[PDB]
């Protein structure tokens, strides 16, 4: 369906970003929406065959356009803290009021004042308890990514090089480690529960992969430590007995 | 391209009587396309302040309009309706007959 | 009342 | 002037029961009304599209009604399953006075949580290999309370599904880098919770 | 008897003189009750019947926005049909639409309508089953495949089965004294001698509503339809209509001709003579 690029974007105030979108094959109209915490899903602008159709309460510093290949770009310039939101792109066959729009995965944008608070997470896995194995005949591994800011993280489990979704649970939203501080580091926990016989085999390999989205290359880094760029941090376990 | 010539009827709203105010009507219908020139005439002169109805069409898509204005007929003044259309090379003028 | 329909040709 | 309001904002119900989600809009001049579900990490999925002059739409276990004269809409969900857990959004296609074209107007949304029925409850608190404590296998009526101390970190309940075994289990993790005997003292844990 | 509510639309393009001219009107039976013209100083849905003026501001705000969107949509269609028929952008072209519903004496739906035209000829029409289309040429078939994919007929069917009949009943009750109270025609016969041996007897019918009327001449009781000059029913300008029928009669046999007027405003058909 609809594809949006990039997936995540973390930059500073006063910067300028570009969000790309590609409608479905045969779709002639494209839509842009903004979903923030204090306003919900809000309409921005709509283009139809490279021409502007409808327009909402869009700021002058927001520029959008549609190209002859029907893909669209949305320029968010002079970014403020309030611009941090989830931007969706939708498309439709045309302008029929009896049809529906098809939305894409969205682009998550977080605007910060200074980037000195951005940190990648530390990933660690925790082997199941022998008391749980002997009581339920099931084994539960717990993964934990600590100390990361902002919350642009994607956690996944891997078993023998293959991603698994059965028996997997992950927290819906990361929690603040020091909620008294407004620039607090976040933390996220996840669980994977398999049969005790599967965990007892030392042939199986378990991997917790945390996909972190950090600073892009457009932002200057003048600090001693390494630049917190979009990276992957992982922890693994093999299982015994 | 479908081009249909307008039919013309020029009449009064009420039965005409010399000295009484009335309304002189010119009903054009059965024409295509919609763009049309209709003028009401008094002794050959174009009457001003002439109003017309909103455009509409029949079941065969042919349009119709009613042009009208106030007038007071006399036995000495002759009224008529002038219509020009793409289908008419000559501006057609139909005299107003009190008995029709 | 009128029909609410946007159906381009 | 077109404003959409959805009530309630959150709704947690046990598995299997029927559901009623409400939606209201101010301007009755609409072209259609839609119901979307929004999963985190993914976009919006169209559930039902009610035309302007239609009064109801049905697809599967979903039924939605529309009344423009009253400006209301209701989404009926029969036999709610845990897979229906999502944020249900109510949208309206309508124009605005003295503007170019029409657009969609969304509501705040209703966060629906269809808690699964635990077949065989078994509350217990274990300890995992540090490179954390695991309160797991507790019924849906168990309430997980946040830790009083900020240095002690506690997550909320979360449901994993072992599909090959028809097994569902709620769990929560509590840890601190400063014992699993008093980690969940704030929560109303069942006294039958097993402590090895 | 039976009643109907219809909406007419006409968009005429004027390449170089600005945006296309757009005029839409609404009728209940033979009574105009709403109008919208794009050339007006303030393009708004305006009342044309005293019984429709009792609707609130939300009624006129809705019908104005729906007519404005209809105007803008036809402007996109006028450019679209230029490519369908390979026509120059310099010529003026017409787009017409008409939709409505007929109801019976019990108020139930009798027939729903929706059909479009381009330059005076049929384009695409909603069939009587409210679930299919009839296209006139290959260009209209392009539109047909678009509307079927977008399920346009489903909204039309819902409107013709519901909103069209419900609001038509509201207008018939709110204007009962004008929409359901027929106005009989005022009748009289005039004499016009042509020659010294023949004359013309014209049977007048004035100020009647609705426009449906039947004028027939009878000579000793026989219908003179072959020799009856009949003119089209014409609006008087005050919601009423006019019509007359004339027969050339020889001088001295005027009393042997009788006029017969049929109208729903008459409980009994009226027979008149030259007097
Ligand atoms: C928008 O951003 C792109 C890339 O950042 C840039 O090339 C373009 O000039 C900007 N403005 C417009 C109107 O596209
Ligand atoms: C939702 O609408 C239904 C419709 O009758 C009503 O019974 C119910 O009370 C409404 N719910 C709320 C929370 O207002
Ligand atoms: C748990 O306790 C909170 C305390 O505010 C309450 O709001 C909630 O209804 C309780 N139950 C659940 C299932 O969260």
TrEMBL record, chain E:
<dbReference type="GO" id="GO:0030670">
    <property type="term" value="C:phagocytic vesicle membrane"/>
</dbReference>
<dbReference type="Pfam" id="PF07654">
    <property type="entry name" value="C1-set"/>
</dbReference>
<feature type="disulfide bond">
    <location>
        <begin position="101"/>
        <end position="164"/>
    </location>
</feature>
<dbReference type="InterPro" id="IPR007110">
    <property type="entry name" value="Ig-like_dom"/>
</dbReference>
<keyword id="KW-0391">Immunity</keyword>
<dbReference type="GO" id="GO:0098553">
    <property type="term" value="C:lumenal side of endoplasmic reticulum membrane"/>
</dbReference>
<dbReference type="GO" id="GO:0031901">
    <property type="term" value="C:early endosome membrane"/>
</dbReference>
<keyword id="KW-1133">Transmembrane helix</keyword>
<dbReference type="GO" id="GO:0000139">
    <property type="term" value="C:Golgi membrane"/>
</dbReference>
<dbReference type="InterPro" id="IPR036179">
    <property type="entry name" value="Ig-like_dom_sf"/>
</dbReference>
<dbReference type="GO" id="GO:0012507">
    <property type="term" value="C:ER to Golgi transport vesicle membrane"/>
</dbReference>
<keyword id="KW-0812">Transmembrane</keyword>
<dbReference type="InterPro" id="IPR003006">
    <property type="entry name" value="Ig/MHC_CS"/>
</dbReference>
<keyword id="KW-0490">MHC I</keyword>
<dbReference type="GO" id="GO:0002474">
    <property type="term" value="P:antigen processing and presentation of peptide antigen via MHC class I"/>
</dbReference>
<comment type="similarity">
    <text>Belongs to the MHC class I family.</text>
</comment>
<dbReference type="InterPro" id="IPR013783">
    <property type="entry name" value="Ig-like_fold"/>
</dbReference>
<dbReference type="InterPro" id="IPR011161">
    <property type="entry name" value="MHC_I-like_Ag-recog"/>
</dbReference>
<keyword id="KW-0325">Glycoprotein</keyword>
<dbReference type="InterPro" id="IPR001039">
    <property type="entry name" value="MHC_I_a_a1/a2"/>
</dbReference>
<dbReference type="InterPro" id="IPR050208">
    <property type="entry name" value="MHC_class-I_related"/>
</dbReference>
<feature type="disulfide bond">
    <location>
        <begin position="203"/>
        <end position="259"/>
    </location>
</feature>
<keyword id="KW-1015">Disulfide bond</keyword>
<dbReference type="InterPro" id="IPR011162">
    <property type="entry name" value="MHC_I/II-like_Ag-recog"/>
</dbReference>
<dbReference type="GO" id="GO:0042612">
    <property type="term" value="C:MHC class I protein complex"/>
</dbReference>
<dbReference type="Pfam" id="PF00129">
    <property type="entry name" value="MHC_I"/>
</dbReference>
<keyword id="KW-0472">Membrane</keyword>
<dbReference type="InterPro" id="IPR037055">
    <property type="entry name" value="MHC_I-like_Ag-recog_sf"/>
</dbReference>
<protein>
    <submittedName>
        <fullName>MHC class I antigen</fullName>
    </submittedName>
</protein>
<feature type="domain" description="Ig-like">
    <location>
        <begin position="185"/>
        <end position="271"/>
    </location>
</feature>
<keyword id="KW-0732">Signal</keyword>
<dbReference type="InterPro" id="IPR003597">
    <property type="entry name" value="Ig_C1-set"/>
</dbReference>
<dbReference type="GO" id="GO:0055038">
    <property type="term" value="C:recycling endosome membrane"/>
</dbReference>
């Amino acid at each position: 369906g609809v594809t949006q690029t990039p997936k995540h974007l973390i930059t500073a105030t006063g910067q300028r970003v570009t969000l790309r979108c590609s409608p479905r094959s045969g779709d002639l109209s494209v839509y842009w929406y903004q979903q923030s915490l204090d306003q919900g899903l809000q309409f921005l602008i709509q283009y139809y065959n490279g021409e502007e159709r409808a327009k909402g309460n869009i700021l002058e510093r927001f520029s959008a356009q549609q190209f002859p290949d029907l893909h669209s770009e949305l320029n968010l310039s002079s970014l403020e803290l309030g611009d941090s939101a989830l931007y969706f792109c939708a498309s439709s066959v045309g302008l029929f009021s009896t049809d529906t729009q098809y939305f894409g995965p969205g682009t998550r944008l977080t605007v910060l004042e200074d980037l000195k608070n951005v940190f990648p997470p530390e990933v660690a896995v925790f082997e199941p308890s022998e008391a749980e194995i002997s009581h339920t005949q099931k084994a539960t591994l717990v993964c934990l990514a600590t100390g990361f800011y902002p919350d642009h993280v994607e956690l996944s489990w891997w078993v023998n090089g293959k991603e698994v979704h059965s028996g997997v649970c992950t927290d819906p939203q990361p929690l603040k480690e020091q909620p008294a501080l407004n620039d607090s580091r976040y933390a996220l926990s996840s669980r994977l529960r398999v049969s005790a016989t599967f965990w007892q085999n030392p042939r199986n390999h378990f991997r917790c992969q945390v996909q972190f989205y950090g600073l892009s290359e457009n932002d200057e880094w003048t600090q001693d430590r390494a630049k917190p760029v979009t990276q992957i941090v992982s922890a693994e376990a093999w299982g015994r007995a | 391209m479908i081009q249909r010539t307008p039919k013309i009827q020029v009449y009064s709203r009420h039965p005409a009587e010399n000295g009484k105010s009335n309304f002189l009507n010119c009903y054009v219908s059965g024409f295509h396309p919609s763009d049309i020139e209709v003028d009401l005439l008094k002794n050959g002169e174009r009457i001003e302040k002439v109003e017309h109805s909103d455009l509409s069409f029949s079941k065969d898509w042919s349009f119709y309009l009613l042009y009208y204005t106030e007038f007071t007929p006399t036995e000495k003044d002759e009224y008529a309706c002038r219509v020009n259309h793409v289908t008419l090379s000559q501006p057609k003028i139909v005299k107003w007959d009190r008995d029709m | 009342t009128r029909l609410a329909l946007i159906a381009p040709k | 002037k077109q404003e959409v309001t959805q009530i309630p904002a959150a709704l947690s119900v046990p598995e299997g029961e029927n559901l009623v989600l409400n939606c209201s809009f101010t301007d009755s001049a609409i072209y259609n009304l839609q119901w979307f579900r929004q999963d985190p990490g993914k976009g919006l999925t169209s559930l039902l599209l009610i035309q302007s002059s239609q009064r109801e739409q049905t697809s599967g276990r979903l039924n939605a009604s529309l009344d423009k004269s009253s400006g209301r809409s209701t989404l009926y969900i029969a036999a709610s399953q845990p897979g229906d857990s999502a944020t249900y959004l109510c949208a309206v296609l309508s124009p605005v006075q003295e503007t170019s074209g029409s657009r969609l107007t969304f509501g705040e949304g209703t966060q629906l949580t269809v808690n699964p029925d635990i077949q065989n409850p078994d509350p217990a608190v274990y300890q995992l290999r540090d490179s954390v404590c695991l309160f797991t296998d507790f019924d849906s009526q168990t309430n997980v309370s946040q830790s009083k101390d900020s240095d002690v970190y506690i997550t909320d309940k979360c449901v994993l599904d072992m599909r090959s075994m028809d097994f569902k289990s709620n769990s929560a993790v509590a840890w601190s880098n400063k014992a699993c005997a008093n980690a969940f003292n704030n929560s109303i844990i069942p006294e039958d919770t097993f402590f090895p | 008897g039976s009643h109907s509510m219809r909406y007419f639309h006409t968009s005429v393009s004027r390449p170089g003189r600005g945006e296309p001219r757009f005029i839409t009107v609404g009728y209940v039976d033979d009574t105009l009750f709403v109008r919208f013209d794009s050339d007006a100083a303030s393009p708004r849905e305006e009342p044309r019947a005293p019984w429709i003026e009792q609707e609130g501001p939300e009624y006129w705000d809705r019908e104005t926005q729906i007519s404005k969107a209809k105007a803008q949509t036809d402007r996109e269609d006028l450019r679209t049909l230029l490519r369908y028929y390979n026509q120059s952008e310099a010529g003026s072209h017409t787009l017409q639409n008409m939709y409505g519903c007929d109801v019976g004496p019990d108020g139930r739906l009798l027939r729903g309508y929706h059909q479009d035209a381009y330059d005076g000829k049929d384009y695409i029409a909603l069939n009587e089953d409210l679930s299919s289309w009839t296209a006139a040429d290959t260009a209209a078939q392009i539109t047909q495949r678009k509307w079927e994919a977008a399920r346009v007929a489903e909204q039309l069917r819902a409107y013709l089965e519901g909103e069209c009949v419900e609001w038509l009943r509201r207008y018939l009750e709110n204007g009962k004294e004008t929409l359901q109270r027929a106005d009989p025609p005022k009748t009289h016969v005039t004499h016009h001698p042509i020659s010294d041996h023949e004359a013309t007897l014209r049977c007048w019918a004035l100020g009647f509503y609705p426009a449906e009327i039947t004028l027939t001449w009878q000579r000793d009781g026989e219908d003179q339809t072959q020799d009856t000059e009949l003119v089209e029913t014409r609006p008087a300008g005050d919601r009423t209509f006019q019509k007359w029928a004339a027969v050339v009669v020889p001088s001295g046999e005027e009393q042997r001709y009788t006029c017969h007027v049929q109208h729903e405003g008459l409980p009994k058909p009226l027979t008149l003579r030259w007097e």
